[PDB]
Design a protein around this ligand. Structure first.
Ligand SMILES: O=c1ccn([C@H]2C[C@H](O)[C@@H](COP(=O)(O)O)O2)c(=O)[nH]1
Ligand SMILES: O=c1ccn([C@H]2C[C@H](O)[C@@H](COP(=O)(O)O)O2)c(=O)[nH]1
Ligand SMILES: [Mg+2]
Ligand SMILES: [Mg+2]
Ligand SMILES: [Mg+2]
Ligand SMILES: [Mg+2]
Ligand code: NA
Ligand code: NA
Lengths: 224, 224
């Protein structure tokens, strides 16, 4: 399973633009090992979405909606790593169906191994395969979380003044509703996808009350 | 750096007894990969004690007291793994001083690699080396956290009714004060160590108001 190369390139452009919001000269400041560590830590969030602990709340239920968020986060970081290292310098590492918690725990631990080896392109392929298997719209999730990531930067995430959970709702949870109106074809159609990505962005901006003047539309992010 | 084999054996006995509190037949129920995953997840807690994120609260300070707690947690799990697999089936993986955050991030990521390879004895050696380098009393930390772990089980940790942070204080934080009166010699002295471990246990029981009747003294845990 792979995305169209034109879709992958647009996602990469979005990723570069977001990384530039975080730091103008990120391509000089960041190193491959940074992206390895970030993927590791998202992979721990992903594992922690399951009731893996045999000593703590053993009848807990998995947070399968959060799984989608953490896979999307891994994609942001694997796209970023791939901009710095091609893998030169799947069925062995990923186990389907991921609906089986044993398969998920094994697979997602193997993502950490791939990350440590700086096989970022393979991590991207793993995430695409995982979304295909689970049946969620990875591209739409990406555009939505990309927008939230930018919003967080606007609202002081980098200086420690942001609050992610408010009135019982984590910011990430509001993304599901922003994405549900969009089909896979909507966000991958060769001629029209950019308009649909723009629509996702504005839904996320609405969800967080971003004043119109502070919003960045799809064209901000693309080099095509 | 290593502990006396008699001290290591007593720690292993304590570990077996705690694992038995969690499940009577843990030696049949648990598998090596469980301990790999647990060490991985504690290693993520440990990494997250540092200001590693370049996009979120970049001027945050490391939680160096929590570092001691997470290393102690790793030891519990590496002792446990070693009861199931000897490594048959350091300066390369650990970088000193760990006071240097770059050294810490690299070292603690390498603990995840060692855990995935099920080199539990090597993980134990890493933790002992880390405490020696940082200069904290690993054995005293172990006995204190071992006691809290048992307390958590008494107070519904396994069924999801426990609350770890109360009135602004996480349970782990109360351990530091329980341990500070004890020297390295106190808790490793060949003839007298068991009394000092018992004393640590009772200090932790006091910290949590454990009724005298529910307390388990040092003799509960030892087979010597
Ligand atoms: O240079 C960076 C740093 C962070 N992120 C994004 C990707 C993930 O979706 C998100 C995770 O944020 P945390 O919740 O882990 O803070 O951060 C980037 O895209 N680029
Ligand atoms: O079979 C088990 C399960 C857990 N722990 C202990 C070791 C760590 O100190 C502690 C970590 O607990 P959490 O905070 O991760 O729940 O659990 C054990 O000793 N044995
Ligand atoms: Mg994260
Ligand atoms: Mg995440
Ligand atoms: Mg833990
Ligand atoms: Mg811990
Ligand atoms: Na998360
Ligand atoms: Na912790």
């Amino acid at each position: 399973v792979s995305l169209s190369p034109l879709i992958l390139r647009s996602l990469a452009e979005l990723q570069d633009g977001l990384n530039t919001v975080v730091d103008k000269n990120w391509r000089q400041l960041r190193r491959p090992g940074d992206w390895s560590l970030a993927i590791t830590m998202e992979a721990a969030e992903l594992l922690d979405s399951y009731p893996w602990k045999w000593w703590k709340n053993v009848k807990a239920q998995p947070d399968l909606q959060n799984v989608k968020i953490e896979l999307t986060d891994i994609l942001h970081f694997s796209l970023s790593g791939a901009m710095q290292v091609s893998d030169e310098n799947l069925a062995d590492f990923m186990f389907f169906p991921l609906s089986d918690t044993n398969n998920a725990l094994a697979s997602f631990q193997n993502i950490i191994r791939l990350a440590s080896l700086q096989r970022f392109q393979l991590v991207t392929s793993a995430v695409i395969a995982a979304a295909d298997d689970i049946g969620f719209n990875l591209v739409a999730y990406y555009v939505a979380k990309h927008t939230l990531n930018g919003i967080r930067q606007m609202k002081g995430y980098k200086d420690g003044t942001y609050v992610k959970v408010q009135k019982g709702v984590e910011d990430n949870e509001l993304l599901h509703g922003c994405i549900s109106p969009f089909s896979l074809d909507d966000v991958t159609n060769e001629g029209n996808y950019k308009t649909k990505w723009d629509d996702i962005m504005h839904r996320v901006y609405d969800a967080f009350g971003t004043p119109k003047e502070e919003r960045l539309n799809i064209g901000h992010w693309l080099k095509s």
